[PDB]
């Protein structure tokens, strides 16, 4: 134990950086070293673990139960949520906006969970600097009812926008600067003013590159109400009015993305822009350009669903806001790859798929270390309810593909039907993580 | 009448200047005099070196007196001359402003009667197709692909047992397939060229640019741009087991005799941005000039992009010529920017001859340099003739005209040709001389 402990504990650290994943990494590393203590080369076991995972992955992606119906989806969403009002509500949000739609959860003052489908957008671009982060706990930058500034050129000088910024301050409203880029004295002036509590802003880089990013800025302009300050279409920033700036009720900016909630753009105005693109998709001359415009239109028209959480206590709101959020991405994940049996059942009956490979020498061992780890997820559950490590594992190891032992129920019955499940992606991802962490523990130290 | 020998020799110079115009007229005169001197008992070699010393002096004289072309207004106006059109010039200056002076700038056929300018992601390198049979536009000697998948292989490809499993999954997409690998060897090659002629499966094969590690880096750069993994059996990615998930995507690929251009890849703006940052920082942690030179080079391909001037017309005759006016203009602007611009109408080479007086030469070195003094007035004297004006006469008039003033072969109105839009990239002029002197030194050596 003494060394394995100082090892496993060390494995609890790496894992905790971004729990089946965790338990598996510890179930891989120790079982790895015990074989490295026999004199088996790590690059030999690693090679056997990697290959072993590959096979275990198809096994999960093949034995996956599809999810399409507003019934099934609601169920998934309902699981992770630990609630039906959330599962039903998340299935309704995906019903409207779509499976791949933009669902935004937000904690509200009202009592019951609300849904709301408003005009809005989200693109693949986070804040330029993490200093803009308002809620450090979620490393996010939320702006309440801000003005939106669109700039197709780069912003570096402060003195060009300053006149407009002055009106924004006087407006007593925050700002979202979406420009080609925001650097230099400009970027710093924004940050400092934000820290000083002087001026509430978030800088974000436009979506794409050249012409196609300049058309997206337009979609945002139209959605938001504002008008892209383009030195080529329009004039200089000097003589500006607040009317050039779009507005929204909330802008959420994270490390990787920016969501605009309820653009102030004319509904009829957005509809026309959606139409304009709808024609380009037909007058298109390329499949590539066709698929790009399709998504561009997909956003403007798709809107942004919002799920407001019921108040009670600061501690409740927060968590409740996260649980729904998790249930959304969990239910969004299930529809993406399918679902698999709850508990550690799916991972057990995954080992007998390793035998169908070329089990050789060291690698075969590495591959066996996995057939061991795959039995770690269930072991923990058993260790919990207070049962026999081996017997629980063994008994399950026998039952038909899709039958295992739930806690609350404590019955060697069907797990999936019993309302117990895991998104294959979530399960299959855990595994790929463990292998990835175990892969550092072999090569490095 | 002209001397038979001098003609049999003047024709010979033309046909040579063909494979390798102002240079032709220039060389012909350099050779015409050399012969007369050699016949009069002058050492060829001695006569030659005198020509060389002479040219370098004139090469330096031209370059110094070059009306610097730097502002957009300038560029746009240079090109306006090479295209005899303002809008065509203005747009090129624009394309040169966003993609950068030395930046990629292609001209594409437009289904729209006008002239549009697209700016997107993408890059170009100095590597043509391995096989010419891949060509799709026999006129332009190019192989163009629509929505082409990109397969990046960091290793030479010869076998067939590995590609088929992938190529099939590609055929199902109903989409072309640009493949960049260390090379495409005889076997799999035919598999590509054949299925391509059989129209079974359209595709092209370009050899990756670079060497060893330096190359794998560029393939990675193209991986990041297009949005696809690089096939590398050493790491853990086997070509045998591959899906579209690995391959990358683009809108328009164009492969020529010795160049590949990819128009807008499918990689994320983050990914692409990271490689740019990674390189920018890599350049800063490096102190090696070679290393940093090659890094800025790779940075420009990623951060640069590609301009696409869209030239619309009706008839194919005008469409292909419109697509040449612009192309030619683009290269002139790029050239004007490199070494400056100067007065056209073959007026500078004449007004340059006096500089050779600053050169003290003895014997055949003096004669060699004095053949040039004469040869330098050839281009103008030639333009003069094809106008119906006595060559000599105009040669003298211009000689006594202000620096930059000469006969305008269009309107015949002696004036400031620079102000008259009668200019030339000193690059084009300097090279004309250099080549003319290169050919001449041949007819005064080889047998």
Q: Within 13 A of B155's CA, how many CA atoms are on the CB side?
A: 14
Cα(B67)–Cα(B79) distance, integer angstroms: 15
Breaks in chain B (C–N beyond 2.5 Å) sit after 20
Breaks in chain A (C–N beyond 2.5 Å) sit after 18
Which of B118, B251, B268 has the CB atom closest to A288's CB atom?
B251
Q: Choose among B109, B111, B178: nearest CA to B148.
A: B178
Q: Looking at beta carbons, which residues of chain A come within 8 Å of B226? A: none
**Residues B327 and B55: beta-carbon distance below 8 Å:** no
Same domain, B184 and B168: yes
- Residue A169's CB is within 10 A of a number of other CB atoms, namely 15
* Domain boundary pick from B317, B340, B363: B340
Cα(B381)–Cα(A421) distance, integer angstroms: 91
Å from A50 to nearest chain B CA? 10
Which of A207, A210, A289 has the CB atom closest to B305's CB atom?
A210
Q: What is chain B's length?
A: 447
* Tokens found for residue B316: 């194919």
Q: Which B residues in the span 235-254 are in contact with A, Cβ-Cβ below 8 Å? A: 236, 249-252
CA B96 to chain centroid:
15
Same domain, B16 and B60: yes
Cα(B207)–Cα(A363) distance, integer angstroms: 36
* Domain boundary pick from B293, B315, B340: B340
Q: Apex CA B40: angle with CA B38 and CA B41, to 5°?
A: 65
Question: What domain range includes position B156?
Answer: 121-305
DSSP of A333-359? HHHHH-EEESTTHHHHTTGGGTTTS--
Contacts of residue B257, defined as CB under 8 A and 6 or more positions apart, other chains included, come to: B128, B129, B132, B141
Using alpha carbons, list the distances in angstroms from residue B259 to B254, B255, B267.
8, 6, 22
Taking the CA atoms of residue A198, residue A202, residue A205 and residue A207 in that order, the dihedral angle to the nearest 10 degrees is -150
- Which residues partner with B117 through β-bridges? B309
Q: Choose among A320, A342, A332: nearest CA to A85.
A: A320
Q: Is A265 helix (H, G, I), strand (E, B) or coil?
A: coil
Cα(A245)–Cα(A226) distance, integer angstroms: 4
Using alpha carbons, list the distances in angstroms from residue A62 to A53, A55, A337, A344.
14, 11, 10, 17
**Strands B149-153 vs B230-231: parallel, antiparallel or unpaired:** parallel
Q: Is the dihedral of CA B408, B414, B420, B425 positive or negative?
A: positive
**Strands A258-263 vs A120-123: parallel, antiparallel or unpaired:** antiparallel
Instruction: Please indicate if the annotation marks A422 as binding a ligand.
Output: yes
Q: Looking at beta carbons, which residues of chain A come within 8 Å of B120? A: 209-212
* Domain boundary pick from B291, B324, B340: B340
Q: Is the dihedral of CA A258, A263, A266, A270 positive or negative?
A: positive
Which of A50, A209, A256 has the CB atom closest to B120's CB atom?
A209
Interface contact flag, B111 A285, Cβ < 8 Å? yes
**Strands B149-153 vs B177-181: parallel, antiparallel or unpaired:** parallel
Continuous H helices in B40-71: 44-64
Cα(A171)–Cα(A71) distance, integer angstroms: 47
Same domain, A75 and A206: no
Q: B412 — alpha (psi -120 to 50), left (phi > 0) or beta?
A: left
**Residues A223 and A121: beta-carbon distance below 8 Å:** yes
Chain A residue with minimal CA distance to B175?
A: A287
**Residues B445 and B34: beta-carbon distance below 8 Å:** no
Q: Choose among B179, B168, B399, B147: nearest CA to B263.
A: B147
Cα(B93)–Cα(A219) distance, integer angstroms: 28
Cα(A207)–Cα(B269) distance, integer angstroms: 8
Q: Looking at beta carbons, which residues of chain A come within 8 Å of B175? A: 287
Cα(B325)–Cα(A288) distance, integer angstroms: 29
Interface contact flag, A288 B264, Cβ < 8 Å? yes
Same domain, B138 and B264: yes
Q: What is the CATH classification number for the domain harbouring B110? A: 3.30.260.10
Contacts of residue B350, defined as CB under 8 A and 6 or more positions apart, other chains included, come to: B376, B377, B379, B380, B395, B398, B399, B406
Same domain, A44 and A97: no
- Residue A43's CB is within 10 A of a number of other CB atoms, namely 12
Same domain, B331 and B276: no
User: Using a CB cutoff of 8 Å and minimum separation of 24, what contacts does A246-250 make?
Assistant: A246/A147, A246/A148, A246/A150, A246/A220, A246/A221, A247/A145, A247/A146, A247/A147, A247/A148, A248/A120, A248/A145, A248/A146, A248/A148, A248/A176, A248/A224, A249/A118, A249/A144, A249/A145, A250/A106, A250/A142, A250/A143, A250/A144, A250/A145
Contacts of residue B268, defined as CB under 8 A and 6 or more positions apart, other chains included, come to: A124, B227
Interface contact flag, A288 B121, Cβ < 8 Å? no
Interface contact flag, A211 B119, Cβ < 8 Å? yes
- Which residues partner with B115 through β-bridges? B311
Q: Is the dihedral of CA B354, B355, B358, B362 positive or negative?
A: negative
Continuous H helices in B198-235: 212-226
**Residues B216 and B222: beta-carbon distance below 8 Å:** no
Taking the CA atoms of residue B197, residue B199, residue B203 and residue B207 in that order, the dihedral angle to the nearest 10 degrees is -10
In a 10 Å sphere around its CB, with 0-12 CB exposed, 13-18 middle and 19+ buried, how is residue B11 labelled?
exposed
Same domain, A132 and A270: yes
Q: Is B430 helix (H, G, I), strand (E, B) or coil?
A: helix
CA max distance for chain A: 78
Q: A244: which DSSP letter?
A: G
Chain B residue with minimal CA distance to A50?
A: B236
**Residues A61 and A428: beta-carbon distance below 8 Å:** yes
Cα(A223)–Cα(A218) distance, integer angstroms: 8
Same domain, B91 and B133: no
Q: Looking at beta carbons, which residues of chain B come within 8 Å of A289? A: 251
Interface contact flag, B269 A124, Cβ < 8 Å? yes
Instruction: Please indicate if the annotation marks B103 as binding a ligand.
Output: no
> What is the b/e burial string over A350-384, where b = at least 16 CB atoms within 10 angstroms of the residue's CB?
bbebbeeeeeeebbbbbbbbbbbbbbbbbbbbbee
Same domain, B161 and B215: yes
Query: Which residue in the block uniquely carries the two structure tokens 């016949």?
Result: B39
Query: Which residue in the block uniquely carries the two structure tokens 């003069």?
Result: B384
**Residues A178 and A278: beta-carbon distance below 8 Å:** no
Contacts of residue A362, defined as CB under 8 A and 6 or more positions apart, other chains included, come to: A40, A41, A44, A45, A47, A48
* Tokens found for residue A429: 């991802």
Cα(B257)–Cα(A58) distance, integer angstroms: 44
Q: What is chain A's length?
A: 445
Interface contact flag, A211 B249, Cβ < 8 Å? no
**Residues B61 and B342: beta-carbon distance below 8 Å:** no
Q: Within 13 A of A303's CA, how many CA atoms are on the CB side?
A: 16
Using alpha carbons, list the distances in angstroms from residue B137 to B126, B132, B179, B184.
19, 11, 19, 21
Contacts of residue A29, defined as CB under 8 A and 6 or more positions apart, other chains included, come to: A7, A8, A11, A437, A438, A441
Contacts of residue A190, defined as CB under 8 A and 6 or more positions apart, other chains included, come to: A132, A177, A182, A199, A201, A203
Q: Choose among A270, A246, A268, A267: nearest CA to A258.
A: A246
Q: What is the CATH classification number for the domain harbouring B278? A: 3.50.7.10
Same domain, B223 and B312: no
Which of B111, B269, B270 has the CB atom closest to A209's CB atom?
B269
CA A390 to chain centroid:
36
Same domain, A379 and A325: no
**Residues B33 and B54: beta-carbon distance below 8 Å:** no
Q: Looking at beta carbons, which residues of chain A come within 8 Å of B244? A: none
Contacts of residue B156, defined as CB under 8 A and 6 or more positions apart, other chains included, come to: B181, B182, B183, B184, B185
Cα(B268)–Cα(A123) distance, integer angstroms: 12
The number of distinct structural domains making up chain A is 3
Solved with: X-ray
- Residue B352's CB is within 10 A of a number of other CB atoms, namely 23
Cα(B17)–Cα(B434) distance, integer angstroms: 12
* Tokens found for residue A69: 């119906």
Same domain, B125 and B11: no
Q: Is the dihedral of CA A324, A327, A333, A338 positive or negative?
A: negative
* Tokens found for residue A264: 């102030």
**Residues A177 and A190: beta-carbon distance below 8 Å:** yes
Q: Which A residues in the span 139-158 are in contact with B, Cβ-Cβ below 8 Å? A: none
Query: Which residue in the block uniquely carries the two structure tokens 């370098």?
Result: B56
Continuous H helices in B113-159: none
**Residues A213 and A189: beta-carbon distance below 8 Å:** no
Q: Is A111 on the interface with B (CB under 8 A)?
A: no
């Amino acid at each position: 134990d003494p060394y394995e402990k100082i090892g496993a504990e060390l494995v609890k650290e790496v894992a905790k950086k971004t729990t089946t994943a965790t338990v598996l990494a510890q179930a891989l590393v120790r079982e790895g070293l015990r074989n490295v203590a026999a004199g088996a080369n790590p690059l030999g076991l690693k090679r056997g673990i990697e290959k072993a995972v590959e096979k275990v992955t198809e096994t999960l992606l093949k034995g996956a139960k599809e999810v399409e119906t507003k019934e099934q989806i609601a169920a998934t969403a309902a699981i992770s949520a630990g609630d039906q009002s959330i599962g039903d509500l998340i299935a309704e949000a995906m019903d409207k906006v779509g499976n791949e739609g933009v669902i935004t959860v937000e904690e509200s003052n009202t009592f019951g969970l609300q849904l709301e489908l408003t005009e809005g957008m989200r693109f693949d671009k986070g804040y330029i600097s993490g200093y803009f982060v308002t809620d450090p706990e979620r490393q996010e930058a939320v702006l309440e009812d801000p003005y939106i500034l669109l700039v197709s050129s780069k912003v570096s000088t402060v003195k060009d926008l300053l006149p407009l910024l002055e009106k924004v301050i006087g407006a007593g409203k925050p700002l979202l600067i979406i420009a080609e880029d925001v650097e230099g004295e400009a970027l710093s002036t924004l940050v400092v003013n934000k820290i000083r509590g002087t001026f509430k802003s978030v800088a974000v880089k436009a979506p794409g590159f050249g012409d196609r990013r300049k058309a997206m800025l337009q979609d945002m302009a139209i959605l938001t109400g504002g008008q892209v300050i383009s030195e080529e279409v329009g004039l200089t920033l000097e003589n500006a009015d607040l009317s050039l700036l779009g507005k929204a009720r909330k802008v959420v900016v994270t490390k990787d993305e920016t969501t605009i909630v309820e653009g102030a753009g004319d509904t009829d105005a957005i509809a026309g822009r959606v139409a304009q693109i709808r024609q380009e998709i037909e007058n298109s001359d390329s499949d590539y350009d066709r698929e790009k415009l399709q998504e561009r239109l997909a956003k403007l028209a798709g809107g942004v669903a919002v799920i407001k959480a019921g108040a009670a206590t600061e501690v409740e709101l927060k968590e409740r806001k996260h649980r729904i959020e998790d249930a959304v991405r969990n239910a969004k994940a299930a529809v993406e790859e399918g679902i698999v049996a709850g508990g550690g059942v799916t991972l057990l009956q995954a080992a007998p798929t390793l035998d169908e490979l070329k089990l050789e020498g060291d690698e075969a061992t590495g591959a066996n270390i996995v057939k061991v780890a795959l039995e770690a997820p269930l072991k923990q559950i058993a260790f919990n309810s207070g049962l026999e490590p081996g017997v629980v594992a063994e008994k399950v190891r026998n039952l038909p593909a899709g039958h295992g032992l739930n806690a609350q129920t404590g019955v060697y019955e069907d797990l999936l039907a019993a309302g117990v499940a895991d998104p294959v992606k979530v399960t299959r991802s855990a595994l790929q993580n463990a292998a990835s962490i175990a892969g550092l523990f072999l090569t490095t130290e």
